Amino acid sequence: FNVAHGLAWSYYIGYLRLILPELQARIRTYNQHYNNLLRGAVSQRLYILLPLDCGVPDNLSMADPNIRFLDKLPQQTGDRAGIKDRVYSNSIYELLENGQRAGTCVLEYATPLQTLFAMSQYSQAGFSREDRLEQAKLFCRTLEDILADAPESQNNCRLIAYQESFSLSQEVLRHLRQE
């Protein structure tokens, strides 16, 4: 173990609560400079990928070649715990359908899941691969419950959970099109 409870709460307090209040204005700033009638605007919410037992690569294109990096948002800075101008950066991605762009949005993995699965490599961590699917689901359970009691944050992000045919770019496009 039940290590997920701590990681889910850290993820919310130490990150989501910090960027989500300012995300909509950064997306607005980007769209105002780059949006025109020949293209779709960047979506308005943060899309968080939650692979429950898959890999968590750093390059999204290597999980699905139809997801490709497009641009960065404007940086967000803030002093935290003695670090001056700590940087919070996010990336914009395009979603391809039949070789053509069909969507764009701010996209990223839930990093603590990556940290959680990497405890694989250390015996003193007491985390075996047999527990990842269970702790990963609990992480999603805890985080789902937290944003239920925090509407202002729930409406600025969307969770996308999945396991291992199925296309990750299509799953993303499904959520974008229900908005």
Ligand X SMILES: Nc1ncnc2c1ncn2[C@@H]1O[C@@H]2COP(=O)(O)O[C@H]3[C@H](O)[C@H](n4cnc5c(N)ncnc54)O[C@@H]3COP(=O)(O)O[C@H]2[C@@H]1O
What's the min distance (Å) between Cβ of 52 and a second copy? 15
111 contributes a contact to ligand X by CB under 6 A: yes
CA 136 from centre of chain? 14
What's the min distance (Å) between Cβ of 34 and ligand X? 23
20 interface partner picked from a second copy, ligand X, none, CB below 5 to 8 A per type: none
User: How far, in Å, CA of 74 to CA of 88, rounded?
Assistant: 9
47 contributes a contact to ligand X by CB under 6 A: no
Q: Spell out a b/e string for 141-155, using b for 16 or more CB atoms within 10 Å of the CB, else e.
A: ebbeebbeeeeebbe
15 marked among binding-site residues: yes
DSSP string, 15-61: IIHHHHHHHHHHHHHHHHHH--TTSPPPPSSEEEEEESSS---SSGG
Out of 3, 15, 144, 171, name the contact with ligand X by CB under 6 A.
15
- Interface residues with ligand X (CB under 6 A)? 10-11, 14-15, 83, 88, 111-112, 115
Binding-site members for 3',3'-c-di-GMP are 10, 15, 86-89, 111
